[PDB]
Amino acid sequence: DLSQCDREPIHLLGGIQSHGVLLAFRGPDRLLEVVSANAQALLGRPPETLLGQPVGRVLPAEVLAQWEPLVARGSVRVVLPAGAYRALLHESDGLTVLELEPAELQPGMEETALEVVRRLVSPLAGVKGTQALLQTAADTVRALTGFDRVMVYRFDADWHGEVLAESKRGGMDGFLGMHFPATDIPVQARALYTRNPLRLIADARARPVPLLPPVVPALGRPLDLSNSALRSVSPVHLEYLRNMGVGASFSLSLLKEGVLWGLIACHHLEPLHISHERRRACEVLTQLLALQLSAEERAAEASEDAHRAALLGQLATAMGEGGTLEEVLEKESERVLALTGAAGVALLLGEEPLLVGCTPAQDEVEALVAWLATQPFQTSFHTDRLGTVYPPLAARADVAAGILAVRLAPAAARFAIWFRPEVARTISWAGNPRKPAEPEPGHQRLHPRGSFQAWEETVRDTSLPWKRADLGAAEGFRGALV
Amino acid sequence: DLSQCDREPIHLLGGIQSHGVLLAFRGPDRLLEVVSANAQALLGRPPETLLGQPVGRVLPAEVLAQWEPLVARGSVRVVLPAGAYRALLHESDGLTVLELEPAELQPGMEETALEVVRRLVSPLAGVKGTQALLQTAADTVRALTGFDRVMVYRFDADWHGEVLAESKRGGMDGFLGMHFPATDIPVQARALYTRNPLRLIADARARPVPLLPPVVPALGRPLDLSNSALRSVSPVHLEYLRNMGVGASFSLSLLKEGVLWGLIACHHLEPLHISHERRRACEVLTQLLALQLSAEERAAEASEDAHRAALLGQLATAMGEGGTLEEVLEKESERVLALTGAAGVALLLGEEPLLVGCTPAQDEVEALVAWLATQPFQTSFHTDRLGTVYPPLAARADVAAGILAVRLAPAAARFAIWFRPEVARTISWAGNPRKPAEPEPGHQRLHPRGSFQAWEETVRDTSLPWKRADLGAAEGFRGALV
Ligand SMILES: *C/C=C1/C(=C/C2=NC(=C\c3[nH]c(/C=C4\NC(=O)C(C=C)=C4C)c(C)c3CCC(=O)O)/C(CCC(=O)O)=C2C)NC(=O)[C@H]1C
Ligand SMILES: *C/C=C1/C(=C/C2=NC(=C\c3[nH]c(/C=C4\NC(=O)C(C=C)=C4C)c(C)c3CCC(=O)O)/C(CCC(=O)O)=C2C)NC(=O)[C@H]1C
């Protein structure tokens, strides 16, 4: 439900962070059209007086000197009186945007970064778990940035999240294991972080620096800061950080195969600036983890299919040895249930239902048997909470919280149905998820919740979720019984 | 093993390359036990005068100054009158081995390597092929190293190889597409390159520097140089390099899930030395490429399986519909042959064989059947050159160069046999593959071939290979035939 939270235009807030300067230029004279109000502390003159002036009248030589590789490459290091700065160039709203922030100061940064890239490639990671892969990614991002807490955050299908892994200094509270509402990161934020994979919040208590003028005159709204490294973030999120007791924040999008899988989120208790070059070095790490997860995930999935296929094949064999449907199905009980990781299975071969392992009563199966016919599924149907869809069996969570059903005939209702019991799960939410925000009276002013202490909830009446291999295995069993 | 080529103990040749110095110390007094004969060029005095001295009294002060971190990290930079050097430690034959080698002179090396690691780890790699991956891998190694010609070299199953990709500077001889005898890299070299994944030959024309004494006194043979970065290589190979017109060579092992998959092989026309840290940066790229390849390959196999499972799912639906068996093995003719990418199929389900598509005559199929029933196979059998093993069909490469057979019953002869035609292939070898070496009369001194000019051969009478997904699909078909 697109509430207040999803409707704040976080690319049109018109402010930048105080540690950098932003200038925007228009046209072939490159006339200054927008400038951050703090620009005097790097240009020498009041920002108000530079609007409408050509880039050659406005920038210092050291910068202009490096315009071509800047335009070609996006960023260059320039040494100005105030010190070493990184200059970043992009295009937005038909303007050339130039940002300046302090440059990396450690000469051996790239050398350290190459070493941790090795830890994260290595012969084989994931060796004792994809778990171990996440922990190393957290550990190495924490090594390269120096943040007090680094966490790997995975989105669930409903866009709520949980901290799978976490590397942090001794003496820091943690969030390992906890789940967070989907509204902690609303729709338009997720969309932006799909496009802009990096964001640094250098000081969560600093006031944002405004742009001048406050609109782009051509457009009647603020400059689009979607791709600004200096963009100041939603004030609601600043409040969220300060309620966590967080003084600086850095997060990196984990894009797996083009989709937003999760984040690596970093917290620091005191303000902290990370250089652009160091941020891009961390981003190489996150692209690395994303690749290691894909290769391991696909290996896991091929090994699972292998196991299922061996079962179908041993089944196949058994049938070729004595015309004995019920006979062999009863003899190969483990295999038929193992096919899909099930605890029971009804085989509707026409006459009576044949019930193997742990199932609902004969009456009750016929009841969902009849109900299954009038359903809009083609050849297979599956659910991990039968009760939420067919309450005649809502009380049988003990044997049928989940079913996987394949249709063995066109017209007619001949099926094999696998059953799963519920599996109770205790999840710990970081604060009470029924009160994920605090709106003011009148529900125009929204605020973050004030507490992130564990709030425990137990999930009932849902099975283990049917995996792609379960489905494939069911399709193959259907091919063999036709 | 076979040739004299496999016999040469290449880790026991007792020589190092002239750009570095090797020292080996024994026991608690760190007494110098083995030293390269050029050691004076770095330590002022006659090496022979140094055997038996404690490390503290042989090594220059500058190296000693760094002793603690060297043994710790195993590598360190030291500034000596002669220039900056990388000091490397490892253990061999119970000695501590110290190697000295000119250090990297460009301070921006690591920044550069991080840039090329981006190009290769980036989102959307291979997104115009694994071919594009290899091309990118060669291009990035060539840029990082400066070598004239960089090639990606893949081992076939018989351990001969072919250049799959190549990045070289304008107007340079190439080898793209050519095949090289397995003996070009004999067995003990392949073994050594699986555990020591980097090798540099700085000057293909230089004489090796001997070690003193020529044996380890305790062992009566020379110091094991398996792990030496300075190891001078087999003389037959140096002769092979010079016959190629190559003055410097550097290659890296490509390990993919533990096995030796290929090499990245670089040639320079003149001598050239890459620093150790620059070679370790290149090693990061090859580990990257191997990761990229596993993920792309396991994705390709998943997509293949899904296409086959879709075919089986459509066959399953044509069954349980109208008619007999031969009455759906008839429109699904197309599907039945597509299961395994085949041009024909014979079905022995009881009566006479049922022949679908491009098959050999019924009498020939009957005789093949009779023959297959006596071979030693459980469920499936396959070959891509039927003729070598069953010469009654050696003449029929037009329809039956390859076969794939599943048993549809136990002690019975019920089969499904899929057929492929031959696919002619034009291999171009780098020189005459019938003369891969030139021995001297008496067969005690071998030399490499003199020529690498293209040498054509056409492989006849072999089908396209039966891949994993064909085999899985066949097993799937057998499960539906019961
Ligand atoms: C009413 C709307 C709400 C809201 C808005 C909001 N949050 C934003 C950014 C953001 N949230 C998170 C959440 C987390 N940070 C953590 O460490 C954890 C758990 C470990 C979670 C769940 C993150 C990581 C970010 C990114 C910024 C950062 O610190 O890394 C934004 C976008 C901010 C922007 O302008 O870019 C918005 C609009 N948060 C709420 O809780 C409610 C009230
Ligand atoms: C009778 C033995 C023979 C022999 C021995 C041999 N070769 C060795 C190393 C080596 N060979 C190759 C081959 C290639 N180089 C290329 O560029 C291509 C293709 C374009 C090929 C096929 C390589 C790459 C290497 C590794 C060293 C390198 O140059 O990168 C060795 C081991 C050398 C060592 O001591 O490490 C041996 C013993 N080669 C023959 O041709 C026959 C005569």
Numbering used by the authors:
A (entry chain B), B (entry chain A): 9 to 490
Excerpt from the publication:
To assess the impact of both temperature and X-ray dose on the two structures of SaBphP2 and complement our earlier studies on the related SaBphP1 PCM, we also determined the ambient temperature structure of wild-type SaBphP2 PCM, essentially free of radiation damage as a result of using an X-ray free electron laser (XFEL). To gain a detailed understanding of the function of the S. aurantiaca phytochromes, we examined the crystal structures of SaBphP2 PCM at cryo and room temperatures. The wild-type protein crystallized in the dark in the Pr state in space group P21. Crystals grown from the PCM constructs diffracted to 1.65 Å resolution at 100 K and 2.1 Å at 293 K. Our spectra suggest that time-resolved serial femtosecond crystallography experiments are feasible with various pump-probe time delays with SaBphP2 crystals spanning from the ultrafast to slower time scales. In this study, the SaBphP2 wild-type microcrystals diffracted to 2.1 Å at SACLA in nuclear grade grease [supplementary material Fig. 1(b)]. In the SaBphP2 PCM crystals, subunits A and B form a noncrystallographic dimer.
Phytochromes (PHYs) are red-light sensing enzymatic switches first discovered in plants, with homologs in the photosynthetic and nonphotosynthetic bacteria. PHYs are composed of a photosensory core module (PCM) and an effector, enzymatic domain. In bacteriophytochromes (BphPs), the PCM consists of three domains named PAS (Per ARNT Sim), GAF (cGMP phosphodiesterase/adenylyl cyclase/FhIA), and PHY (phytochrome-specific GAF-related) [Fig. 1(a)].1–5 The effector domain is typically a histidine kinase, covalently linked to a PHY domain, although other nonenzymatic output domains can be found. However, both proteins bind the same bilin chromophore and share a large amino acid sequence identity (38%).5,14,18 Biliverdin (BV) is an open-chain tetrapyrrole that is highly conjugated and allows for reversible photoconversion in BphPs between the red light absorbing (Pr, λmax 700 nm) and far-red light absorbing (Pfr, λmax 750 nm) states. Here, we report three crystal structures of the SaBphP2 photosensory core module (PCM), lacking the effector histidine kinase domain.
